[PDB]
Amino acid sequence: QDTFIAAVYEHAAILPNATLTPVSREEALALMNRNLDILEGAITSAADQGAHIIVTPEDAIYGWNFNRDSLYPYLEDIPDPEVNWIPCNNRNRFGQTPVQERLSCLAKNNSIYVVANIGDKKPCDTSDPQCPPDGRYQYNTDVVFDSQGKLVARYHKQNLFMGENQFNVPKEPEIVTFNTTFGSFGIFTCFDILFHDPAVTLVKDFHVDTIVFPTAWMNVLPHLSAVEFHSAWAMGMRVNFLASNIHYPSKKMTGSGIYAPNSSRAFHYDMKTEEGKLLLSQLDSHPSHSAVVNWTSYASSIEALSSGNKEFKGTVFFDEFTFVKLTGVAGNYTVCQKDLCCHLSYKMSENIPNEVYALGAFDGLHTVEGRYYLQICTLLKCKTTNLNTCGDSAETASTRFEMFSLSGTFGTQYVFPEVLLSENQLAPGEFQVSTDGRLFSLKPTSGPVLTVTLFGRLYEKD
């Protein structure tokens, strides 16, 4: 089969109450089942529209407020899928596994692949020298059930966010795929998307067609809003990408979508309501990709578009960029930091007097809430008129662009092209990436621009 219908669900989770000691197994199961009641509504609705697969979010059934002990009662022992097991048809093969059982039956009864995120426990003895003092491993765990209810994938999250003290890191990164009649699938979770293992390996070495991606992502503008970065990673890696996110505006969680190599196909962003949201779209089972992009090609072939720049320092997500202000309604600028030079040609649709845009370059190691090496060229709207706010989180803008073209001398082939419009809207079909590494407009932007950015990772320098 050449196409399929993908579904993702953004979930307004029912969170356990704050308490002082762990709840009982029974209480934990009752809460998880309240969340599974809502997810069932989304799963059935998707199947009722012909979806072949649905993704649900990270932490969707029990939330994220835990220590090791308060989490324990929510956990089950999830077997390796090689055991060949359909929980719905063979309950009790592995003791008490009611969550796995209900997920299996949801997939089977609605004849749909179901991707979900739950918690694994693996009891161990002191005979095992890595066994934690308290007698078990606890893992953040994606599970996939096929349309017969069979367990076909289990993935323990490799790259834990700071504050995920309730979980362990696996001994070695787990490279997890599953094959279907509508393509080869890979899987990883939230923060994993910023790292090499397993995310990059799945694409490079295992040639997956599609990624399924449960997440509970906290939006950080200008470069790491969920719909923005997730759609860019898909475009840069040339895969289909099903992003299912938590809905919790209180912690800046919102941003789900279905992304293809050429463009976003559907997205949802909502900071105002507490509603969940189901998105569907057709995708190609084996997406065609253009020619491989050389990200330094055009940029290394030209001379600086400007010189005698008035340059200044600005902070973007704790990293010190080198910026130059855009003075004209139209222009051509070049700005550099260390090994990276960034080039921008642009024309605004009109100059908004009290609105300032800057071009920035960064080439260095990020360290706050994670350690990773970045190379970034960014056009962005500065939060205020003051240049000290270029790089700050900016939600809205009024300046539309008639044209833009951005490029840089990247020392990596892993670069993710981002375009975000005012109110955190994507710009599907409005831009393109050339083989020589230019990100450029195909027409005037449909709304005002917050950023156009080339976000690059040098995994070897982490």
Ligand X SMILES: *[C@@H]1O[C@H](CO)[C@@H](O[C@H]2O[C@H](CO)[C@@H](O)[C@H](O)[C@H]2NC(C)=O)[C@H](O)[C@H]1NC(C)=O
Report what 136 binds from ligand NAG, ligand X, none; CB cut-off 5-8 Å by kind: none
Q: E-assigned strands of 292-397?
A: 311-316, 319-325, 330-337, 340-348, 357-366, 372-381
Verify binding: residue 365, ligand X, rule CB under 6 A. no
Q: Among 347, 372, 459, 461, which residue interacts with ligand X (rule: CB under 6 A)? A: 347
DSSP 3-state of 316: strand
Residue 61 or 420 with smaller CB distance to ligand NAG: 61
Amino acid making up residue 250: S
Order of strands, sheet of 439-441, starting from the edge strand that comes earlier in the sequence: 330-337, 340-348, 401-408, 439-441, 431-433
Smallest distance, ligand NAG to C-beta of residue 102, A: 5
Of the candidates 121, 157, 277, 383, the residue annotated as catalytic is 157
Q: Which is nearer to ligand NAG, 406 or 419 (CB)?
A: 406
Tokens (6 digits) for 362: 């960064």
179: contact with ligand X by CB under 6 A:
no
Piece of the chain touching ligand X by CB under 6 A; list 4-12, 309-317, 340-348, 360-368 = 340-348
Q: What is the DSSP letter of 20?
A: S
Residue 345 binds which entry of ligand X, ligand NAG, none, with Cβ cut-offs from 5 to 8 Å by kind? ligand X
Q: How far is the CB of 294 from ligand NAG (least distance, A)?
A: 4
400 binds ligand X (CB under 6 A): no
- Residue 73 has φ and ψ, to the nearest 5°, of -65, -15
Query: 103 vs 153, which CB is nearer to ligand NAG?
Result: 103
Nearer to ligand X, 252 or 347 (CB): 347
345 binds ligand X (CB under 6 A): yes
Neighbours of 428 (CB within 10 A): 18
- Asked if 330 interacts with ligand X (CB under 6 A), we say yes
Cα–Cα distance, 381 to 399 (Å, whole number): 9
Q: Is 328 exposed, middle or buried (0-12, 13-18, 19+ CB in 10 A)?
A: exposed
Q: CB under 5 to 8 A by kind: which of ligand X, ligand NAG, none does 306 bind?
A: none
Position 12 contacts ligand NAG (CB under 6 A)? no
Residue with structure tokens 């009722």?
48
- Contact string 21-60 vs ligand NAG (x = CB under 6 A): ----------x-----------------------------
Under the criterion CB under 6 A, does residue 112 sit at the interface with ligand NAG?
no
The DSSP symbol for 253 reads B
Shortest approach of ligand X to residue 306 CB, angstroms? 10
CA separation for the pair 352, 119 (Å, rounded): 51
**CB within 8 A of 362, min separation 6: which ones?**
316, 319, 320, 321, 322, 337, 340, 374, 375, 376, 378
Asked whether position 148 contacts ligand NAG by CB under 6 A, the answer is: no
Total binding residues toward ligand X, as defined by CB under 6 A? 7
**58, 76, 101, 228: the active-site residue:** 58
- The nearest distance, CB 347 to ligand X, in angstroms, is 4
- Taking the C-alpha atoms of residue 461 and residue 367, their distance in angstroms, rounded to an integer, is 12
Using rule CB under 6 A, residue 200 touches ligand NAG? no
CB–CB of 132/168 below 8 Å?
yes
297 binds ligand X (CB under 6 A): no
Per the rule left: phi > 0, alpha: psi between -120 and 50, beta: everything else, 117 is beta
Instruction: Identify whether 190 is a catalytic site residue.
Output: yes
297 interface partner picked from ligand NAG, ligand X, none, CB below 5 to 8 A per type: ligand NAG
H-helix or E-strand containing 233?
helix 226-237
In the set 88, 105, 190, 341, the catalytic residue is 190
157 is known as an active-site residue: yes
Secondary structure (3-state) at 30: helix
| 332 interacts with, out of ligand X, ligand NAG, none, CB within 5 to 8 A per kind | ligand X
Half-sphere exposure of 181 (CA within 13 A, CB side): 8
CA distances from 335 to 300, 321, 325 (A): 13, 10, 10
Contacting residue, 1, 2, 17, 303, with ligand NAG by CB under 6 A? 17
Q: Which of residues 280-319 bind ligand NAG (CB under 6 A)?
A: 294, 296-297, 300-301
Residues of this chain that interact with ligand X (CB under 6 A) are 330, 332, 345-347, 403, 405
Residues taking part in catalysis: 58, 157, 190
Return residues touching ligand NAG (CB under 6 A): 16-17, 31, 102, 105-106, 109, 294, 296-297, 300-301
